[PDB]
């Protein structure tokens, strides 16, 4: 089912501090090597009054390098696909919730992303656009209630040094019954390779490989 090189196509719709936006994206990656690229075009709500980094983790764990001794909950979930529900709690009470229904047909992955954000302070790093990048991270994967849960202590480096903390909690739900893995970790690194003046156009890179402690 999952080809060694899979094309990506998506559409994110949402609101941050009540600001409606729509972002379409087309990308390409290698799911077995755990890397992928995505070119994102802001279709609606441009210019964005908030930092683009807060959207980057919502823009697919199928694009993870999985060893043999660790069942791949994500790749096994296909052709049908899976879906995820994510909460992202910032240290300044600014909170985001996101969802994605991931489907497939041919060599292309398809996503429908819903992202909602609120209670970000006007003079904070997000709304003032003071965020430079997400520090690299490790997501703790464990099975709960028959589905896969993931937790990651995220942190955005800011303009002028210092970090901006976020607590991520995700629930991955396979559309079919699959072999549930035993608890593991996912080392990740997401980075915006290139962008324009207001991030109307963005190239985004991700690298993630799963392992045991």
Author numbering: 3 to 61, 65 to 218
Original paper wording:
eCGP123 is a bright green FP engineered for extreme stability, and was developed using a two-step process. Phanta was isolated by expression screening of a library targeting amino acid positions 62/63/65/69 and 191/192/193 in the bright green fluorescent protein eCGP123. Phanta contains the substitutions Gln62Met, Thr69Val and His193Gln.
The absorbance spectrum of eCGP123T69V showed a major absorbing species at 506 nm whilst eCGP123H193Q contained significant amounts of a 387 nm species in addition to the 506 nm species. In the case of eCGP123H193Q titration above pH 8 did not diminish the amount of the protonated form, suggesting that two distinct populations of the chromophore exist, only one of which can be titrated for pH. The results show that under violet light illumination recovery of the ON state for CGP123H193Q driven was minor, whereas thermally induced recovery of the ON state (no illumination) was near complete after 35 mins incubation at 25°C. The conversion OFF to ON rates for Phanta, eCGP123, eCGP123H193Q and eCGP123T69V were determined and are similar. These results suggest that photoswitching of eCGP123H193Q into the ON state is inefficient. The spectral data obtained for eCGP123H193Q suggest the possibility that both the protonated and anionic chromophore are present in the structure but only a single chromophore species appears to be represented in the structural data. However, electron density corresponding to the 4-hyroxybenzyl ring in protomers of both the weakly fluorescent eCGP123H193Q (ΦF, 0.004) and strongly fluorescent eCGP123T69V (ΦF, 0.32) is well defined, indicating a rigid chromophore, and suggesting that a mobile chromophore is not responsible for poor fluorescence emission of eCGP123H193Q. Instead a hydrogen bond is formed between the Nδ1 of Gln193 and the Oγ of Ser142, which in turn forms a hydrogen bond with Oη of the chromophore. In eCGP123H193Q contact between Glu144 and Arg66 is maintained through a water-mediated (H2O783) hydrogen bond. Collectively these data suggest that the very low fluorescence efficiency of Phanta and eCGP123H193Q is a result of removing the stabilising effects of π-π interactions between His193 and the chromophore in the excited state, together with alterations to the scaffold extending around the chromophore.
